[PDB]
Amino acid sequence: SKEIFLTVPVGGGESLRLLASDLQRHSIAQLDPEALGNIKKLSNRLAQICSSIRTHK
Amino acid sequence: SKEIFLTVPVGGGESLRLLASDLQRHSIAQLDPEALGNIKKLSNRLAQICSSIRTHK
Numbered sequence: 001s002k003e004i005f006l007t008v009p010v011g012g013g014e015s016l017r018l019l020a021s022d023l024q025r026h027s028i029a030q031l032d033p034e035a036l037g038n039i040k041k042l043s044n045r046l047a048q049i050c051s052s053i054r055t056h057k
Numbered sequence: 058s059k060e061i062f063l064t065v066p067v068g069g070g071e072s073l074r075l076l077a078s079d080l081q082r083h084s085i086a087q088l089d090p091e092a093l094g095n096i097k098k099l100s101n102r103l104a105q106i107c108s109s110i111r112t113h114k
Contacts, residue, residue: 001064001066001072002066002069004063004064004065004066004095004096004099005063005064006061006062006063006099007058007061007062007064008061009058009059009061012059015058020095020098020099020102023099023102023103023106025106025109025110028103028106028110029106029109029110036110036112038061038077039061039103039107040107041077042061042063042077042080042103043100043103043104043107045077045080046080046085046096046099046100047100047104049080049082049085049086050085050096050097050100052082052086053082053085053086053093055093
């Protein structure tokens with residue numbers, strides 16, 4: 001494991017392998033309703049951590 | 058694999074396991090300079106896909 005990726009199990013079984021070096025839109029737009037919710041929260045919460053970090057200091 | 062998580066290899070070896078159900082801030086603030094860059098892009102690009110999807114239609 002060298003590259004970064006997200007694991008979003010389609011529905012509730014097989015886990016998906018989507019690398020950040022590409023981040024396919026459809027791969028996420030083909031998930032289940034419950035999945036879309038998790039993803040949205042993933043980016044939202046994450047975005048908060050970044051700003052919280054001091055990169056200008 | 059049922060829960061969603063991100064894999065950010067610290068420096069360049071062992072991959073990290075950070076679930077989205079918690080998303081630890083420090084775990085990301087302790088990574089390497091090259092890692093922080095990838096993460097920031099991960100959330101940015103992802104955020105675009107969401108808005109691209111039609112959830113109001």
